């Protein structure tokens, strides 16, 4: 389809332009609320872990796909394998309130304890990047902090996820003619 | 609705499960559906 | 009461000793309009005619299970085999017709079978070749067997350069017993024909 | 008595993608309002279909240069979402997190030459099975399309999805090096005083492009 | 409080044939379409009833040869689905994975001689209790049937299912060597110039043949 | 029943032809969807196992009875006794994606973990035999791969099974007059 | 329906349990039911 090449309005020259027809296309596996609510591993510290979603790595699935959005809203539920007792603390409380047990602790039940946390940020929508102080994110961009005796592996997933204002997403650079990796085979 | 797969109702109501949203008083689906197609000039068969 | 003369395209095949045509696995064709081809398929009506081939010489010294396996499609040096080197994806059925002409004084029989995906067989496996689309030939009753099968396959269109779905199999169930008044050696021929081919995707020219 | 159950075996382990939701612990939270906030996308294909993104050629550039010699092959790249040319595209950014796809892939071709330079091009789809064509005479027998540079300077050609199977793998096989999904070739046929002038190309998701089966194969 | 249950004992172990389905882990999968695809069978008896398969005789052959002497016994094989003659049949292929059956077993008898050789045959069912008959005079007092070779060259005789119990074991007993389910005998009565000519036999499932209680006794 | 001996149309000379009558026959135990959805053992490797159904043995019940079909469609659910964590991977992902935990792992819950997998193949119907490269099956004929620290015994069953185009089924060859084996007895 | 034995409805909906089938727009039960029977010639009692 010949177009106006610079107006940057969307054009889709479909396959009917040279004969043929299009089929019914289903897009459930690329939905933004379906692709983001599954568990991802992050590396923990020993005791205190702020529950920021931008400490998910950039090589994983829903860490590199969360950074597709500029602004995101999602309720977090965590799943942490620990020993001792794990106290969750809401957004913006003093970090001395991690030791107190009136805050929502979870007693140790083998092997791990998963629990659903609300969106406790003051902002209407969180963000993945912010040019305010030249890390380089405010202290308000967190779901709170969890503190145990020694956390071993704590996992994030983010549900009811709404995303806004897309950002570029990068696949790794081939040095060959095409990036050929060893696919699974019998 | 998400990645839920249960036909039963939830046990905890709605407000001990999620954070309730508040109204006050989408885009790229409208952007991708206004896409021009066909041709630009007089076509033949 | 008998209509016993088939034809495909502009070629006919009259036999007077037809016990009947056996439709294997289906009486009608699948949906040719798939979603894995975006509607860029087209029927080539000029591929539907017979083409003859030689199979083997059933002699009196052949024991049980002298089988013959030719993979369809074989080397077609006409219109149909031009489509194999000019189109990437294509599908078709088959309607085979083998002939074993002796006379009504020979004995024995040979089973004929269209069998999909056939490789690495045993002679102990030959006892159950009846499961496939099959039709016996004995000289006491008939001379031909006329089997018709649709396109089977793992997926709707096929790459025939890397895959051969069907396999015409003739094996000998009872040995050829000539008599004082029979025919010494019979030769098994076959004329095979495609049905409703559909090619999709033009190769670039070799130049 | 009490209601008897059987604590069944094999069930109840922690699966990372299950539709079981976790029990709440801290209720009565009312979020700040977010309604009619600008720039929301719902599915990742609508971003990939409404926003085309550049390709990659020799020299880390998105444009391809016209060729003033007897050879008329501007570009000839294999058709996969793990290709070398498709690598910096957003369409192959999210197709790095899936296993298999289907559908058309739009290619957008904007000519950035001056008003006195004229040229015409062609783009053909060579299905797999033999060697890809090296001349526009040989590539006339593909599913091709031609266009010349005039007032509207952009051309969009939708790559057909031809395959045996219904879905094709978005990851090209590590050992198998023939690339049996297909090639796409674009040539120049002629040019008038178009030396040193460019043809910037783009790629977008098609009208019926849809991906399938998400995995996490670590971001190359 | 919470709803009290009793985690009952003895229940909940992993059984390999149970009707409990496993919990899913990865949803939203749409298969490629498969509708009206050719050659589908639903039950294994319909393959065994619509497709007869050959038997096994001395010399690894399916045909039995006419006998030009005073002895007129073409074949005499015991009636079990673990027999020696029934071994290569598809009907005894799937009856190797069950324990007991009932119903008729069709035997198909195609004559492959020339147009000048004529013969007639008989097949009788000798129920268990005494020795099987060795002459067609003695086997006239069974539930028998005769046919001669003419224009239609195939004969189908349905073996009756006579038993005390309602179901009979498809596996002949290892120690018990009398074979107390029955014999089936087929003879020739006469033949005219049918020396060296064959009678290929087949077997199929009957109209009311049905198997029962699947096991896995390792494929002999 | 005298017939046309070579037309190969089905003929069933029933028991009414010499007096008598037929009874009602029930065929639930020979249904193709009932006989195939039960657990079968396959031998595992140490860590990585492609979930191909043609690695079931040829002596077992639903391995020798799956090879009755040329083309089959069936959803697989596995049951694996392991130690560590077992990550399932869909069809055609790179085999380096077995280590990542965003893929559907199952944490170790004693003794074994059974989980239902979808049909993830690209083809409309899988197959049990294929003459494409002269093992001798494509790399697309699998339900994916599972990877643990050390799998001990992993079991297949296949449900909603549809079969097409039957193949011959063989029982073992007697050397005696009849294959007499030691049947169970008090 | 298979080898299920539960009268209760499933917990997970239909699409987090199986793979959903898609229509586009059997044999041996029709083959075994068209079987010829009776005789071929004029029978007696």
Numbering used by the authors:
A (entry chain 1), F (entry chain 1): 1 to 134, 157 to 208
B (entry chain 4), G (entry chain 4): 15 to 39, 66 to 85
C (entry chain 2): 12 to 218
D (entry chain 3), E (entry chain 3): 1 to 220
From the study:
FMDV, a small non-enveloped RNA virus (genus Aphthovirus, family Picornaviridae), exists as seven antigenically distinct serotypes and many variants and sub-types. Structures of several serotypes determined at near atomic resolution have revealed a capsid composed of 60 copies each of four structural proteins (VP1 to VP4). A prominent feature of this otherwise rather smooth capsid is an exposed flexible loop (∼30 residues) on VP1, termed the GH loop. This loop and the RGD motif embedded within it (residues 145–147 in the O serotype) comprise a major site of neutralization by the host humoral immune response and mediate FMDV binding integrin89101112.
Initially for both viruses 2 mM Mg2+ was included in the incubation mixture. Subsequently, for O1M only, we tested the effect of 2 mM Mn2+. This resulted in more complete decoration of the O1M particles than with Mg2+ and the Mn2+ data were therefore used in further analysis. For all experiments, the micrographs clearly showed bound integrin and no evidence of capsid dissociation. Conventional single particle analysis assuming icosahedral symmetry, yielded density maps for the complexes with the virus capsids at 3.1 Å resolution for PanAsia (13,438 particles) and 3.5 Å for O1M (1,649 particles). In both cases the integrin density was visible but very blurred. Unusually, in O1M a serine is present at 134 of VP1, although the loop is nonetheless disordered on the native virus particle.
